[PDB]
Amino acid sequence: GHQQLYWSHPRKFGQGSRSCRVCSNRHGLIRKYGLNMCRQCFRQYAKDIGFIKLD
Amino acid sequence: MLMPKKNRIAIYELLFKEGVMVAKKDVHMPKHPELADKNVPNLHVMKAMQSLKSRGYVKEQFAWRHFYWYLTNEGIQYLRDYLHLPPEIVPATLRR
Amino acid sequence: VNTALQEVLKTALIHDGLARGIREAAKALDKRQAHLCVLASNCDEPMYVKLVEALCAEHQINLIKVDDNKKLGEWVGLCKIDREGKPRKVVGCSCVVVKDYGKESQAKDVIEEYFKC
Amino acid sequence: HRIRITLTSRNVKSLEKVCADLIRGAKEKNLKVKGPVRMPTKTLRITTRKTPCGEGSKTWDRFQMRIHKRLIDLHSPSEIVKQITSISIEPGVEVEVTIA
Amino acid sequence: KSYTTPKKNKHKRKKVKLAVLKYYKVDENGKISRLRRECPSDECGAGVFMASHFDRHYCGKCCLTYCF
Ligand SMILES: [Zn+2]
């Protein structure tokens, strides 16, 4: 049944195991420096992490 | 509800010592990060707390993965009416 | 003494050591924790009286009898919707075998005395 | 018994100020200490799009992390280093003490 | 809502009324007796009798089905 078929697909790789950190989005991910974050909410909450824009 | 009886009672036994617990939102994971000494389905746990919120015994709010439930006076009253503890004792959220 | 039996059954329901029902009670006897249970007579039993006397008067089981089994489940609390008063719809039961963990109550000594003598 | 203090922070002005006042305190407390060894900064690049939809001019914005690090060489025992490190802390600086 | 294929229902358990005589067999005199095969494994309880089929037996929790 579904109790033993919950793990029919191994979620060890791909977009299924690597979802977004904000609202579980599956597009536009940033895996760089351990964010696992979508780009738009990174832009939304990237000013209060101790950041000022220079270039 | 499709959960074992001893697991549910152990969940409110965990909630006796505290006034809140964390739980991630996922429908394909059987493991609990907070409670690790025994097997418990956290899917059924968050279903139990959303049923408790539906009948109006506890609150619930969202922050990006996790639901947060705050026990009130009627919540601990239903706790001591359900698992049948003496009303003199209180949870440890008031020990200041 | 019936008030003491009601208090002991209710306290067993508080402590949750009893096996509510017939089949789980049969599991309890097959696991050998048969100590006390309440029987009855002149019920709606066609042949069940011989079977219940055979399972009762076999090995260290108390001899407690009531008038009928329709009020035996009232002490257990089967389906008591609206528990603050008389429930609107109640179903019946036959027997409940109790496995009480702490056998020191206020009147458990005189109840065990009534069992023994 | 040389002691190395890996001093890391988020800003450069706070890091240089903390290094300067710790050098002044080490000079005032009558101990031997080496010169300030300066390490290069880490410039950390982020290139993302700005348009939520697929229309419009393709515009980009660049995000930069400007973090520095400083390290010094001691000759004092570790108790003096501990009592000058565990006092006068500020938010934005993460300290690291490594014995040698 | 309703498919043209008929509904494939789940196995509803039949109401086997007065099955206690299927557990404790009453002899000519009042005595405990057993007729069904019990599960040899200690994982299942002693009251949990192993199921009796027409030609073999089926275990409940252990699922160790043996044949003659
Ligand atoms: Zn078995």
Swiss-Prot record, chain A:
Belongs to the universal ribosomal protein uS14 family. Keywords: Acetylation, Cytoplasm, Endoplasmic reticulum, Metal-binding, Methylation, Phosphoprotein, Ribonucleoprotein, Ribosomal protein, Zinc. Its cofactor is Zn(2+). It comes from Oryctolagus cuniculus. It is found in: Cytoplasm, Cytosol; Cytoplasm; Rough endoplasmic reticulum. Binds 1 zinc ion per subunit. One of its GO terms (molecular function) is zinc ion binding. Component of the 40S small ribosomal subunit. Component of the small ribosomal subunit. The ribosome is a large ribonucleoprotein complex responsible for the synthesis of proteins in the cell. The modification Omega-N-methylarginine is found at residue 11. One of its GO terms (biological process) is cytoplasmic translation. PROSITE patterns: RIBOSOMAL_S14. Zn(2+) binds at residues 20, 23, 38, 41. GO terms for cellular component: cytosolic ribosome; cytosolic small ribosomal subunit; rough endoplasmic reticulum. This is Small ribosomal subunit protein uS14. The modification Phosphoserine is found at residue 8. The modification N6-acetyllysine is found at residue 47. Its main location: cytoplasm. InterPro entries: Ribosomal_uS14 (IPR001209), Ribosomal_uS14_CS (IPR018271), RIbosomal_uS14_euk_arc (IPR039744), Ribosomal_uS14_sf (IPR043140).
Swiss-Prot record, chain C:
Keywords: Acetylation, Cytoplasm, Nucleus, Ribonucleoprotein, Ribosomal protein. One of its GO terms (molecular function) is structural constituent of ribosome. It holds the Pfam family Ribosomal_L7Ae. Gene3D superfamilies: 3.30.1330.30. GO terms for cellular component: cytosolic ribosome; cytosolic small ribosomal subunit; Golgi apparatus; nucleolus; small-subunit processome. Its main location: cytoplasm. One of its GO terms (biological process) is translation. It is found in: Cytoplasm; Nucleus, Nucleolus. PANTHER family: 40S RIBOSOMAL PROTEIN S12. Part of the small subunit (SSU) processome, composed of more than 70 proteins and the RNA chaperone small nucleolar RNA (snoRNA) U3. Subunit of the 40S ribosomal complex. Belongs to the eukaryotic ribosomal protein eS12 family. Part of the small subunit (SSU) processome, first precursor of the small eukaryotic ribosomal subunit. During the assembly of the SSU processome in the nucleolus, many ribosome biogenesis factors, an RNA chaperone and ribosomal proteins associate with the nascent pre-rRNA and work in concert to generate RNA folding, modifications, rearrangements and cleavage as well as targeted degradation of pre-ribosomal RNA by the RNA exosome. Subunit of the 40S ribosomal complex. This is Small ribosomal subunit protein eS12. It comes from Oryctolagus cuniculus. The gene is RPS12.
From Swiss-Prot, chain D:
One of its GO terms (biological process) is translation. It is found in: Cytoplasm. The lineage of its organism: Eukaryota, Metazoa, Chordata, Craniata, Vertebrata. Its main location: cytoplasm. The chain holds residues 18 to 117 of 119 of the full protein. Component of the 40S small ribosomal subunit. One of its GO terms (molecular function) is structural constituent of ribosome. Belongs to the universal ribosomal protein uS10 family. This is Small ribosomal subunit protein uS10. Polyubiquitinated by ZNF598 via 'Lys-63'-linked ubiquitin chains when a ribosome has stalled, initiating the ribosome quality control (RQC) pathway to degrade the potentially detrimental aberrant nascent polypeptide. Deubiquitinated by OTUD3 and USP21, antagonizing ZNF598 activity.
UniProtKB/Swiss-Prot annotation, chain E:
Coiled coil: none annotated. It is found in: Cytoplasm; Nucleus, Nucleolus. There is a cross-link at residues 25, 31 (Glycyl lysine isopeptide (Lys-Gly) (interchain with G-Cter in ubiquitin)). The modification N6-acetyllysine is found at residues 22, 31. Residues 1-13 are annotated as: Disordered. Monoubiquitinated at Lys-25 and Lys-31 by RNF25 in response to ribosome collisions (ribosome stalling): ubiquitination promotes subsequent activation of RNF14, leading to EEF1A1 ubiquitination and degradation and rescue of stalled ribosomes. Deubiquitination at Lys-31 by USP16 is required for maturation of the 40S ribosomal complex. A zinc finger (C4-type) spans 39-62. Component of the 40S subunit of the ribosome. Part of the small subunit (SSU) processome, first precursor of the small eukaryotic ribosomal subunit. During the assembly of the SSU processome in the nucleolus, many ribosome biogenesis factors, an RNA chaperone and ribosomal proteins associate with the nascent pre-rRNA and work in concert to generate RNA folding, modifications, rearrangements and cleavage as well as targeted degradation of pre-ribosomal RNA by the RNA exosome. Part of the 40S ribosomal subunit. Part of the small subunit (SSU) processome, composed of more than 70 proteins and the RNA chaperone small nucleolar RNA (snoRNA) U3. This is Small ribosomal subunit protein eS31. It comes from Oryctolagus cuniculus. The chain holds residues 83 to 150 of 156 of the full protein.
